[PDB]
Write a protein that binds this ligand. Structure first.
Ligand SMILES: [Cl-]
Ligand SMILES: [Zn+2]
Ligand SMILES: [Zn+2]
Ligand SMILES: [Zn+2]
Ligand SMILES: [Zn+2]
Ligand SMILES: [Zn+2]
Ligand SMILES: [Zn+2]
Ligand SMILES: [Zn+2]
Ligand SMILES: [Zn+2]
Ligand SMILES: [Zn+2]
Ligand SMILES: [Zn+2]
Ligand SMILES: [Zn+2]
Ligand SMILES: [Zn+2]
Ligand SMILES: [Zn+2]
Length: 272
């Protein structure tokens, strides 16, 4: 089994996962009691996106070594990839009972609670991750998103600010920071961050529309009109862009433009 196993390892290292599977299987046909062998077979399937096979082999690894933190964590990952968030949570928790010093386990546990809608737990476990390794902009952004989702816009703002200190080249962090100020009703700060997002990524329709809304909420109707019109060059299909473009014209006393744009909105959705 040893040579088959090592041959499988050599294929694994060169990224050749189908060959690794063949020789791991050959080794296991000769010695089915190696946890590391079952674990490595589960990894090779995992890398090909065979999540159901990965699950079966990681469970075999765990029959032989129930205290493998690595086997529990990768079982949790395979469930996460199948969209089975509650199983992923159960297995991540088992991995952390055995090894509470992995940032990666706490972070992935946060991600699973997030995907289920438990922003509170997401917050708790993203914080743990960040304490063992505070260097990832993505992790700060996601803690930002969890507070945002709970409606803690000020904590959201705080952690988006942290993510942008580490990676100021992120349109999404800039955009969500604007969303967070928008949601507190700080429309001038919103406008500032929305403009940074669009200077970095200038062709999301939704984003030009949200810059429009922020000007509209400030009472800056002629700028609202300019950015709504930009949103509609990119997405001529949006009932909302047409309707708020109408509102902007109405607010300026431009009643015949208001009528034209309200009609456009009502054709795309005649239900309001
Ligand atoms: Cl919004
Ligand atoms: Zn191959
Ligand atoms: Zn043996
Ligand atoms: Zn499969
Ligand atoms: Zn062990
Ligand atoms: Zn161990
Ligand atoms: Zn499930
Ligand atoms: Zn909840
Ligand atoms: Zn819950
Ligand atoms: Zn909760
Ligand atoms: Zn906390
Ligand atoms: Zn708060
Ligand atoms: Zn603070
Ligand atoms: Zn007019």
């Amino acid at each position: 089994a040893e040579a088959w196993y090592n041959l499988g390892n050599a294929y694994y290292k060169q990224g050749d996962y189908d060959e690794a599977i063949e020789y791991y299987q050959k080794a296991l046909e000769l010695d089915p009691r190696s946890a590391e062998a079952w674990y490595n077979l589960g990894n090779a399937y995992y890398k090909q996106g065979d999540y159901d096979e990965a699950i079966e082999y990681y469970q075999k690894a765990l029959e032989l070594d129930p205290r493998s933190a690595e086997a529990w964590y990768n079982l949790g990952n395979a469930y996460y990839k199948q969209g089975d968030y509650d199983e992923a949570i159960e297995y991540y928790q088992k991995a952390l009972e055995l090894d509470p010093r992995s940032a990666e386990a706490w972070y992935n546990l946060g991600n699973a609670y997030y995907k289920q809608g438990d922003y509170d737990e997401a917050i708790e476990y993203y914080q743990k991750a960040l304490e063992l390794d505070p260097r990832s902009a993505e992790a700060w952004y996601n803690l930002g998103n969890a507070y945002y989702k709970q409606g803690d816009y000020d904590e959201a703002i705080e952690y988006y600010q942290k993510a942008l200190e580490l990676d100021p080249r992120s349109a999404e962090a800039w955009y969500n920071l604007g969303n967070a100020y928008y949601k507190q009703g700080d429309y001038d700060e919103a406008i500032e961050y929305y403009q940074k997002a669009l200077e970095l990524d200038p062709r999301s329709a939704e984003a030009w529309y949200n810059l429009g809304n922020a000007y509209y909420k400030q009472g800056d109707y002629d700028e609202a009109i300019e950015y709504y019109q930009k949103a509609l060059e990119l997405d001529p299909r949006s009932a909302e862009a047409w309707y708020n473009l109408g509102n902007a014209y109405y607010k300026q006393g431009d009643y015949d433009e208001a009528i034209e744009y309200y009609q456009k909105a009502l054709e795309l959705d005649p239900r309001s």
